[PDB]
Amino acid sequence: AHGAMIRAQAGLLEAEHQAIVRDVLAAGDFWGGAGSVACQEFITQLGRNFQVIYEQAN
Amino acid sequence: RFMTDPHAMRDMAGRFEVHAQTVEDEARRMWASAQLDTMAQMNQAFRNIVNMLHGVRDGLVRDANNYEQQEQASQQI
């Protein structure tokens, strides 16, 4: 059941990730456009870190 | 435009501060459920994430300030 908790906390973290991407898109101008390579790299780097955590939780 | 709106910029900073706070919280719970190098990787990913979110937050706040600065530097007098 300590495995269930970790999996759940992970799903929870993944929802956060998604909520952040929706906000990065809404604040896209900060990176000079939501489609700017500056924006997409921010997102890509964001995913790399969540992926690490997600992996080790599963 | 967003980046000419000190108030919108400072609102979004808010949202990013809340995300930082959320992810900090979920990291502590998650680290707790974890009960040493796999631990390092997770700790690191968590910090990286929280730092990125701090940056956007500090960036938006700095920019909101500087925009107000550009305005007052060209009205005073």
Task: Return the domain boundaries, chain A.
Answer: 1-58
DSSP output for chain B: -GGG-HHHHHHHHHHHHHHHHHHHHHHHHHHHHT--HHHHHHHHHHHHHHHHHHHHHHHHHHHHHHHHHHHHTTT--
Residues B66, B6: Cα–Cα separation, whole Å: 9
Judged by CB atoms closer than 8 Å, whether chains meet at A16 and B23 is answered as yes
Report yes or no: B42 and B69 within 8 Å, Cβ to Cβ. Answer: no
The H or E element containing residue A36 is none
Pairs across A and B, CB distance < 8 A: 65
Residues B13, B5: Cα–Cα separation, whole Å: 12
**CB of B10 within 8 Å of any CB in chain A?**
no
In 3D space, the residue among B53, B25, B27, B51 whose CA is nearest the CA of residue A57 turns out to be B27
Residue B52: list chain A partners with CB under 8 A.
42, 45-46
What single-letter DSSP state applies at residue A33?
A: S
Tokens matching residue A11: 């799903």
Q: Which amino acid is at A48?
A: R
**Cα–Cα distance list, B73 to A10, A27, A36, B6, B76 (Å):** 48, 26, 30, 16, 6
Tokens matching residue B71: 């305005």
Residues 6+ apart with CB under 8 A from A52: B41, B42, B44, B45
CA distance to partner chain B, nearest, from residue A3 (Å)? 8
Helices B6-33 and B37-72: crossing angle in degrees, nearest 10, is 170
Residues B49, B8: Cα–Cα separation, whole Å: 23
Residue range A1-58 in CATH 1.10.10.10: no
* Secondary structure class of A1 (helix, strand, coil): coil
Judged by CB atoms closer than 8 Å, whether chains meet at A20 and B59 is answered as no
Domains in chain B, CATH or no CATH each: 1-77 (1.10.287.1060)
CA angle A10-B35-A50, nearest 5°?
25
CA distance to partner chain A, nearest, from residue B69 (Å)? 18
- Which method resolved this structure? X-ray
How deeply is A50 buried, as exposed, middle or buried, from its count of CB atoms within 10 A (0-12, 13-18, 19+)? buried
Residues A34, A30: Cα–Cα separation, whole Å: 8
The size of chain B, in residues, is 77
CA distance to partner chain B, nearest, from residue A37 (Å)? 16
